[PDB]
Design a protein around this ligand. Structure first.
Ligand SMILES: Nc1nc2c(ncn2[C@@H]2O[C@H](COP(=O)(O)OP(=O)(O)OP(=O)(O)O)[C@@H](O)[C@H]2O)c(=O)[nH]1
Ligand SMILES: Nc1nc2c(ncn2[C@@H]2O[C@H](COP(=O)(O)OP(=O)(O)OP(=O)(O)O)[C@@H](O)[C@H]2O)c(=O)[nH]1
Ligand SMILES: Nc1nc2c(ncn2[C@@H]2O[C@H](COP(=O)(O)OP(=O)(O)O)[C@@H](O)[C@H]2O)c(=O)[nH]1
Ligand SMILES: Nc1nc2c(ncn2[C@@H]2O[C@H](COP(=O)(O)OP(=O)(O)O)[C@@H](O)[C@H]2O)c(=O)[nH]1
Ligand SMILES: [Mg+2]
Ligand SMILES: [Mg+2]
Lengths: 432, 429, 34, 30, 429, 430
C-alpha cells in the first residue's frame, strides 16, 4: 500500500540514499538495528519481518566497492541488508560507454533480478525513486541501462529520478558534459519525472541560510533527504490534501518530453535563527518562490512557470495555503504561462518535518517543498549542450567512448534530442 | 582493484623502495610484515598493494628489475628491504652501461622472460587486477630500455588494463650521463605509443624544491625519493581509502587527457613547507590550492607560464569541506583563463579522500598535462640531434644490435609529439 | 632525513595521531552512537 | 658561497637551528 | 496605527538600542523576547512596535543600519541585543570615515538596497503603517549620509505616511569632530523636503540637563540615551495606549506644521527632578507645566527666551484632570502671550493618555516649534562657511565624487530655511 | 576587520616596531611563544594551532637588527618570513637605498605585503615606521611607499617618521636624506607623524625623570603612542575613531598631512601618585609645549586641527571641560576657520605597562595628534641645513655616482620651499 522502491546509482546516489534513509529512520523511530524500541506508516519504505525487524526497501547499485563496503561496515550494518547492496569490481570511469556497454551489461541482469526480489514482496507497488548523478559514468551509463530495463519490464510504472545535473560553474569531471548529454537520452525516454539537484544551488542555500561557513556533501545530502522526505510524506502519512506519486506526476508533467522539473524547499534556518522569524505560510511560500531558496541553479524569472506543486508539512491549513497561493498569483515577479492559469498543486500533510540530531536544519513546525515545471529550465540545458559542443567540436575524450564498444553517431543523436528539447522548451514558452 | 608495481633501474628501485616504506607505514605494516594499525580503514584495502601469506604476512605486490646485483643488495639492506618477496628480485650480472641498446635488446631480453613469468604469476594471484605501475628513469639504459621492453609485452597481453608509469626525465642542469639524450629519445617513443599515461619526474625541479620551498641543509636523493613516494601514494590514495568524491587511476586517466597521443603529466604536492612555515602557516585549503599552481612547488622544471593547462586534476586527502575544494579551483578557472585552455570547460578534475597521508591533516596531489610539457622534449631533441649530427657515441648502440634508422624513427616520434603539443597549444575555437 | 619530520607540522604529534574516521561514520550515525 | 659551522648567522642558519631542534624532538620521542 | 523604526550610524544604534530596551520594558517584553507584563493595555496595541512571531515572540520592528560592524557587535552584546531581529543587522565592512559621500553616494548606495528590501518586507507584513521612524545623527558620517539616503528613498514608495526623524545634532563645545559643519549642512535639506516633520536633539542640552537639572556627577552616554528615549517613547504614547484625549503622529504633524517647511522642532520632557529634590517636590501636573516650559529643563541648546514659540504640543501620561491641565495650558498661554505667536490662538496643544512610564504616576513629553532654532542653524551655517570659504577638508568629497554646486545649493538651503524664522518671529498683525 | 598592517623600514623602524609589538603582546595577553593561556584580529592572525602571529613586515638592508630579533626572546612569535633582510645596507645614502640596493628588494617586499594583505578581509590601513635621517629607512621607505600607493591605491597610510633634530643628530648626511625623502613622503603619505628625538629625550629627562635615557625608552614611548592611537579601532569605546575616521580630520588639503604627536601622562611610578590624574590636567599637560613628542614650539605657530584620543576610565564631561578651558585660554591660539577643530576619541581600555619599563600604570591617558602651521619650523631648520651643506657641494658625489642626477636635490629643495610657502599661506589670516 503506497509502496515504493528506492534505487541508488553511483557513489553520489549511494551518499544521497544513505542520507535519505538516515532521515527516514529518524522520522519512523527505527533504530539502526532495525527494530522500533517502544500503525502502518513504514510499509512504504520498510518491510516487516516475523521477528519484528524492518528492512529498507532500497537497492544500492555501484561498480566500485569503496563506498558500499563502508555502508556495510557502518552504523546501518544491521539495518541495511548485506544483500541488495550490489557492487561490481571495476569503476565506470566517467564513461557512458563503460557504464552502458562494458561493465553495465554484466551487472544489469543481477540488478534486475534484485528489482524482481524487491517488487515481488510489494503488494501495492507504486513507484521507483531512483537517485543518481549524470556527471559520472555509472550514474549515466548503468543508470541509463537500468532505467531502460525497468521501463521495458514495468510499462507505465511511476519513475522519479532525483538526478544531480552538472551545475553551471561548479563541476567535478571534464567529460561530465559528455556524460550528461549522453544520459539525457534515457533520462528523457524512460524517466517519468526528473528532478535537478545540482550542487551550486544547495551550496549557496546553505551558505546564505544556515549561517555556517563549512557545510559539505553531508549537508547537501541532508537537504536532499529533507526534500525527498517531503515528497514521500504525502503518501507516508495522512493529511488534509494528500497527493500520491501518479497524483502529482500526471498534473505536473504537461507533455511526455517535458518532465524535467526544478525544485526548492523552505523554510531552512539555523538554531539561532529558528526563534526569530515569523514563519507564516505566506512568507514561507515567498521564500520558496524567490530564486535564492532553490535547490537548482536556474533562476525562474528568465522563464515562465507552467506547473507548480507546493507540498506543505506541519500545522498548515487550507485557508493558509490558499492565501499564499493568491498572493503568489497576484505578485508580478513570476509569470505563469497562458494555457494553464491554475497551474497549482496543493499537497498538505499533518506531520511536521523532523530534524536529525547534529544537523544544521532547525526544528520548524511548518515547511513546504516546491516541485515546479517551467520553461526557465531551458537555460541549464542550453548551457550544458553548449559546453558539450564546445568540447566535442574537435573530438576530445571521444576516443574512450569509441574504444569501449560504442559507436560514433550516438553523440550526434544526443545533441539531436538535446536541440529538440531546447526547441520544445522555447515552443511551449512562446505565446500562442 | 589492485596495482602491481615494477621498479626498473637504480633510480626506479630506490624511488619504488621509498614508495614501499611510505605505503607500508600508511597501511600500518612494519618492516617485519605484520599489521599494527589501529584503524580498520588501513586493513580494509590492504589487498591493493599487499598479498596475504600463509602466516598472515603482507608481502608487497611488487617486482624489482636491474642488471646490477648491487641495487638488490642495497634494496635488501634497506630498512624495509626484507619485506619484498625473494623471487620478485630479478637481477642481471652485467650492467647495461647506461646503454639503451643493452637494456632493451640483448641483456634485457634475456631476463624479461623471467620478469614476465613473475608478473604473470603476480597478476594471476591478483583477484581483479586494476593495473600495473612502473617506476623508472629514462637517463640510464637499465631502467629506460628494460622498462620500455617490459611495457612493450605487458601491454601486449594486458591490453585493456591501466599502465601507470613514473618516468624520471633527467635535465641538463642535473645531467650526469652523456648518452642521456640518446636513452631519453630511445625510450620516450615506446613510452608514448605504448602506454595509456606516462608522467614525469625531474631531478632539477626536485632540487629546486629542496632549495627554495623546503629549504634543507643536506637533502640527498633520499628526500627526493620521499617526495616522489608521497605523491605516488597520493595518486592512489582515493583508490585505497574512502572519500566524499572518489576516483581511481583509470577514473583520473579518462578525464585527464583529451587525446590518446597526449598523455604526459607534471607532478604536484601540497603542503611543502620548511620549519620556518610549518608551525606558523595555518594548514588550509587556500594554502594547498595556492601552492598547487606555482613552479616553486612543481617538481618538474618546465615553467607552466609559457604553457597552457590542457587538463589538471587534484586528489585531496583529509577531512575537508566539499565546496572550497572546487570553489577555489573555480577561482583559478576565472582568474587564469589564459593559463587554462578554452575548448575544455572546467579543466580541473577534483577528488576527495577521507584519509590524509600519515603525519598530515590536509594534503593534495596535483597531476596535470599542459602544453609546457613540450619544452623538455624540445631540449632533449636538441641534444639528441646535436650528437646525432656526427653519430656521437652511436657505435656503442649500433654494435649492440641497434640499426641506424631506429634513431630516425625516434626523432620522427619526437617531432610528431612536439608538433602535436604546440598545435594544441595554439589551437583556437 | 625522516619523512615524518619532513612532512609533518608536529614531528611527533602528527604521525602518532589516529587516522580520522570516514565522513560517513562521523556524520550519518554519530548521534546514534552517542 | 662557503658554508659555515652552526653558530654563525649567515645563510640558512635559522632553518638549520630549527631543523636541529626538531631532530632532537624526534630522537627524544624514540 | 503602525510605526517601523530604523537606527542609523553609531549614535543611532545606541539611541535606538536604549529606546528599544525602554519600550520593551514598558510593554513587558523579556530581553529573550517573551512577555512578562501584567497589564492588558500593553498587549492591546503591542503590534505597533513589536512584530509577533509564530513562536509567540515579539521581535522589534526595527532596522539596524550602520556601515561599521562594531556597532552591530556592541548592540548584540547588549542586554537586549538578542531581542533584535538577526537579519535586520545590515552592515558594511569599511566604516564611512566621518564622510557624507562615503555613506550617501558610493558605499551606502550599494548597502541601502538590502535595507529597503528588509524594510519593505517588514512593512508589507503590517496591516497598515502609520509610518517610518528614524534615529540618527547629522554629526556622524554614516549616521547622517546613509540615513538621509534612506530618508530620500522611503519617500518615493511611502509618500503619505509619517516620517518621524530623531537626529542628534552637535555644538562646538562638545563637538567631537571637525566635520560637523559639512555633515550637517549637507544633511539638513534632505530632512527639509523628505521628512514631514523632524524632531531634533542637541548633545549639549542633555549634558546641561544632567549637570544642572538632575545633578549627576557621572552621567554617561547610557545615562543620556534614556533621557532621549523618554521623548522617543512619549511621542507614540497615544498610539500605543488608550487616551482620554488621544492623538498620534499625524495629529502632531497637522497641529504643529502650519506651513510645510516649518517642521523642525525642539524637545522637552517632564518630570526631571534630582533624587535629592524629588523628596521635597510634589509630583503634580501643576508643577509639571513649568517643568515643561523651563529653559534649563529643555532638550535643545537654544534658550526659549531668545526665540518665540510658533506651535507647541504636550503629551501628558497618567491619571490627571483634563480640566486642570487645560486651564493650565490656557494660563501659560495668557501669562506669556508675547513668547507665543499672536496670530495663531492656542499655540499650545493638549493631548491626554492614560498609561505613564514605569514608576512615574505622571509624565509629560513636550514638542515645540520655537523660532530659536534660528540661532542654532545660523551659527552652524557660519561654522560651515568659515571653512567652506577656504576650500578646506573638501578634497575628501571632491575625490569621493561630489561637486561644488550641490555644496552651494545646500548652503543656500540653510540660508533660506533659517531666514524664515526671524521674519516669522518679528512679524506684526 | 579594522586591519592595520605594520611595516618597519630599516634599523630605526625595526627597533620601534619591536617595542610596539612588545606593547601589543603585553596588552593582548600574548606570550612570547605566540599563544594566549577578537580584539587581536587587527594586529595578530590566528592559525589552526591556536597561535597568533603579528601582521608586520620588518624590512632592513642590513642584518644585525633582524638577527637580534631572530635570536631574541621573540623568536617563536615573529614569522621567519615577512622579516626581510638585505645583505648590504644603504649606509646613510638615499640614492643607494632607493636606486640600487632598494630596487633588488622592493619586489620581494611587495610580494610579502601582498601575502599579508591577502590574509586580511578588512584591510583598513598601513602603519609605516621609519627614520628619514638614515639611508635605508629613507630610500627604501620612499620606494616602498611609492609602490604601495601605486598598487593598492587609496588605502590609508600613516608614516611615523623620525626626522633629524635641529641639534641632536647622529649623522652628517641626514639633511640630504630628509630633504630627498620629504618629496616622496608628501606625494605618497596620507598622514605623516613627527617623531623627533630631542623632544622625546627632554620629555624622558624631565617627566620620566631618567638621568640617562636611551633608544629603548624612546621606542617604548613610541609604542605607547601607537597603542593609544590604534586602541580606538582595537577595543570598544564611547567614541570609536577608525584610521580613516581620524584621517578625514587631519588633512584639510592633500599637501597638509604632517602632524605633531604628544602623549600624557608621561610619568614614573613615584610621581604617578603625587600628581592629580584628572582629564583636564592631562589635557593641559598635553597642550603644554613641554609635554609634546616633537621639538617644535606651538606658540610660534597656530593649530589647524586637533585629535585628542582618551584611553581608560575617562568620561566625555571633563573632556568637554578641558576643551572649553583650551578654547578660553589664549596661550595656545587656533585657526579662525576651524571653530570646532577637535576630534574626541574615547576608549575604555586603560594603558598597560611593560614590566621593567619606565611609564607607570595609570587609569587614564591622552594622545594628541595635531595638524598645525608651526610644523614649518622644523622644515625651515632642515632645509637651511640642506642649503648650508649644498652651498659648496659636499656629500654629493656619493649620490651622483650611485645613479641620482644632481637636479634631484634641487627639485627636492624646491618641493620643501613650496611646502613651507603653503604652510605660511594656510596659516595667514584673512
Ligand atoms: N548531491 C550530491 N552529488 C554528489 C555527491 N558526490 C558526488 N556528487 C556528484 O557526482 C558527480 C560525479 O559522479 P560521482 O560522484 O563521481 O559518481 P559516479 O557516477 O560513480 O562517477 P565515478 O565515481 O567517477 O565513477 C559530481 O559531478 C558531483 O556533482 C554528493 O555527495 N551529493
Ligand atoms: N626614534 C628612534 N629613532 C632612531 C632609533 N634608532 C635610530 N634612530 C634614527 O635613525 C637614524 C639612523 O640610525 P641607523 O642605525 O643608521 O638606522 P637607519 O634608519 O636604518 O639608517 P641607515 O641604516 O643609515 O639606513 C638616526 O639618526 C636616528 O635618528 C630609535 O631607536 N628610535
Ligand atoms: N631522483 C633520483 N634520481 C636518480 C637516483 N639515482 C640516479 N638518479 C638519476 O637518474 C639518472 C639515470 O640513472 P639510472 O637510471 O639510475 O642509471 P641505471 O642504473 O643504469 O638505471 C641519472 O642521471 C641520475 O642522475 C635516485 O635515487 N633518485
Ligand atoms: N546620544 C548619544 N549620542 C552619541 C553617542 N555616541 C556618539 N554620539 C553623537 O554622535 C556624534 C558623532 O557621531 P558618529 O559617532 O561619528 O556617528 P557615525 O559616523 O554614524 O558612527 C557626536 O556628536 C555625538 O553627539 C552615544 O552613545 N549616545
Ligand atoms: Mg568513483
Ligand atoms: Mg484624536
Amino acid at each position: 500500500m503506497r509502496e515504493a522502491i528506492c534505487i541508488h546509482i553511483g557513489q553520489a546516489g549511494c551518499q544521497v540514499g544513505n542520507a535519505c534513509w538516515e532521515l527516514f529512520c529518524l522520522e519512523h523511530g527505527i533504530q539502526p538495528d532495525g527494530s522500533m524500541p517502544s500503525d502502518d506508516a513504514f510499509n512504504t519504505f520498510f518491510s516487516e519481518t516475523g521477528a519484528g525487524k524492518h528492512v529498507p526497501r532500497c537497492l544500492f547499485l555501484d561498480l566500485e566497492p569503496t563506498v558500499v563496503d563502508e555502508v556495510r561496515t557502518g552504523t546501518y550494518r544491521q539495518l541495511f541488508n548485506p544483500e541488495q547492496l550490489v557492487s561490481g569490481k571495476e569503476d565506470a570511469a566517467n564513461n557512458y560507454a563503460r557504464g552502458h556497454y562494458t561493465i553495465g551489461k554484466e551487472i544489469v541482469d543481477l540488478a534486475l533480478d534484485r528489482i524482481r526480489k524487491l517488487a515481488d514482496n510489494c503488494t501495492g507497488l507504486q513507484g521507483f525513486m531512483v537517485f543518481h548523478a549524470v556527471g559520472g559514468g555509472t550514474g549515466s551509463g548503468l543508470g541509463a541501462l537500468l532505467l531502460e530495463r525497468l521501463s521495458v519490464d514495468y510499462g507505465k510504472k511511476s519513475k522519479l529520478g532525483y538526478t544531480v545535473y552538472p551545475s553551471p560553474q561548479v563541476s567535478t569531471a571534464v567529460v561530465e558534459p559528455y556524460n550528461c548529454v549522453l544520459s539525457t537520452h534515457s533520462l528523457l525516454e524512460h524517466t517519468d519525472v526528473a528532478t535537478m539537484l545540482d550542487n551550486e544551488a544547495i551550496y549557496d542555500l546553505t551558505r546564505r541560510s544556515l549561517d555556517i561557513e563549512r557545510p559539505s556533501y553531508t549537508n547537501v545530502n541532508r537537504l536532499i533527504g529533507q526534500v525527498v522526505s517531503s515528497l514521500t510524506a504525502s503518501l507516508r502519512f495522512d493529511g488534509a490534501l494528500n497527493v500520491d506519486l501518479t497524483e502529482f506526476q500526471t498534473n505536473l508533467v504537461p507533455y511526455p518530453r517535458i518532465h524535467f522539473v526544478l525544485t526548492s524547499y523552505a523554510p531552512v534556518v539555523s538554531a539561532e535563527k529558528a526563534y526569530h522569524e515569523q514563519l507564516s505560510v505566506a512568507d514561507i511560500t515567498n521564500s520558496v518562490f524567490e530564486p535564492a531558496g532553490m535547490l537548482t541553479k536556474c533562476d525562474p524569472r528568465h522563464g515562465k512557470y507552467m506547473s507548480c506543486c507546493l507540498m506543505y508539512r506541519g500545522d498548515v491549513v487550507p485557508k493558509d495555503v490558499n492565501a499564499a497561493i493568491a498572493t503568489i498569483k497576484t505578485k508580478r515577479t513570476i509569470q505563469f504561462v497562458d494555457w494553464c492559469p491554475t497551474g497549482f498543486k496543493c499537497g498538505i500533510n499533518y506531520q511536521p518535518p523532523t530534524v536529525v540530531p547534529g544537523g544544521d536544519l532547525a526544528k520548524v513546525q511548518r515547511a513546504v517543498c516546491m516541485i515546479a515545471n517551467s520553461t526557465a529550465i531551458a537555460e541549464v540545458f542550453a548551457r550544458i549542450d553548449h559546453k558539450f559542443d564546445l568540447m566535442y567540436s574537435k573530438r576530445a575524450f571521444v576516443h574512450w567512448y569509441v574504444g569501449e564498444g560504442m559507436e560514433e553517431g550516438e553523440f550526434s543523436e544526443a545533441r539531436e534530442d538535446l536541440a529538440a528539447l531546447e526547441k520544445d522548451y522555447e515552443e511551449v514558452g512562446a505565446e500562442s | 582493484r589492485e596495482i602491481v608495481s615494477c621498479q626498473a633501474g637504480q633510480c626506479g628501485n630506490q624511488i619504488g623502495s621509498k614508495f614501499w616504506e611510505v605505503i607500508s607505514d600508511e597501511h600500518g605494516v612494519d618492516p617485519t610484515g605484520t599489521y599494527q594499525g589501529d584503524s580498520d580503514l588501513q586493513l580494509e584495502r590492504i589487498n591493493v598493494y599487499f598479498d596475504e601469506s600463509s602466516g598472515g604476512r603482507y608481502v608487497p605486490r611488487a617486482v624489482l628489475m636491474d642488471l646490477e646485483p648491487g641495487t638488490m643488495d642495497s634494496v635488501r639492506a634497506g630498512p624495509y628491504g626484507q619485506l619484498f618477496r625473494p623471487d620478485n628480485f630479478i637481477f642481471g650480472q652485467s650492467g647495461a652501461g647506461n646503454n639503451w641498446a643493452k637494456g632493451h635488446y640483448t641483456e634485457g631480453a634475456e631476463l624479461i622472460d623471467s620478469v614476465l613469468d613473475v608478473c604473470r604469476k603476480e597478476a594471476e594471484s591478483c583477484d581483479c587486477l586494476q593495473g600495473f605501475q612502473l617506476s623508472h628513469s629514462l637517463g640510464g639504459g637499465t631502467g629506460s630500455g628494460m622498462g620500455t621492453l617490459l611495457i612493450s609485452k605487458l601491454r601486449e597481453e594486458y591490453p585493456d588494463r591501466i599502465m601507470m608509469t613514473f618516468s624520471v626525465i633527467p635535465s641538463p642542469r642535473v645531467s650526469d650521463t652523456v648518452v642521456e639524450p640518446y636513452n631519453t629519445t630511445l625510450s620516450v617513443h615506446q613510452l608514448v605509443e605504448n602506454s595509456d599515461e606516462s608522467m614525469c619526474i625531474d631531478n632539477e625541479a626536485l632540487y629546486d624544491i629542496c632549495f627554495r620551498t623546503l629549504k634543507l641543509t643536506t637533502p640527498t636523493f633520499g628526500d627526493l625519493n620521499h617526495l616522489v613516494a608521497a605523491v605516488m601514494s597520493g595518486v592512489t590514495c582515493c583508490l585505497r581509502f574512502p572519500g566524499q568524491l572518489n576516483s581511481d587511476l583509470r577514473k583520473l586517466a579518462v578525464n585527464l587527457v583529451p587525446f590518446p597521443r597526449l598523455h604526459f603529466f607534471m607532478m604536484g604536492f601540497a603542503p611543502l613547507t620548511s620549519r620556518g612555515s610549518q608551525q606558523y602557516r595555518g594548514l588550509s585549503v587556500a594554502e594547498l590550492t595556492q601552492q598547487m599552481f606555482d613552479a616553486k612547488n612543481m617538481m618538474q622544471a618546465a615553467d607552466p607560464r609559457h604553457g597552457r593547462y590542457l587538463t589538471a586534476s587534484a586528489l585531496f586527502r583529509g577531512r575537508m569541506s566539499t565546496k572550497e575544494v572546487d570553489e577555489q579551483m573555480l577561482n583559478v578557472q576565472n582568474k587564469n583563463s589564459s593559463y587554462f585552455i578554452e575548448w575544455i570547460p572546467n579543466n580541473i578534475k577534483s577528488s576527495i579522500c577521507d584519509i590524509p597521508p600519515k603525519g598530515l591533516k590536509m594534503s593534495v596531489t596535483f597531476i596535470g598535462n599542459n602544453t609546457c610539457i613540450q619544452e623538455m622534449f624540445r631540449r632533449v631533441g636538441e641534444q639528441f640531434t646535436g650528437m646525432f649530427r656526427r653519430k656521437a657515441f652511436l657505435h656503442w648502440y649500433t654494435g649492440e644490435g641497434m640499426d641506424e634508422m631506429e634513431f630516425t624513427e625516434a626523432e620522427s616520434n619526437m617531432n610528431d609529439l612536439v608538433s602535436e603539443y604546440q598545435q594544441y597549444q595554439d589551437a583556437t575555437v | 632525513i625522516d619523512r615524518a619530520l619532513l612532512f609533518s607540522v608536529d614531528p611527533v604529534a602528527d604521525p602518532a595521531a589516529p587516522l580520522p574516521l570516514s565522513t560517513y561514520a562521523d556524520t550519518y550515525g554519530a548521534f546514534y552512537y552517542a | 658561497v662557503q658554508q659555515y659551522s652552526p653558530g654563525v648567522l649567515i645563510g640558512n642558519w635559522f632553518e638549520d637551528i630549527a631543523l636541529r631542534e626538531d631532530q632532537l624532538k624526534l630522537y627524544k620521542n624514540q
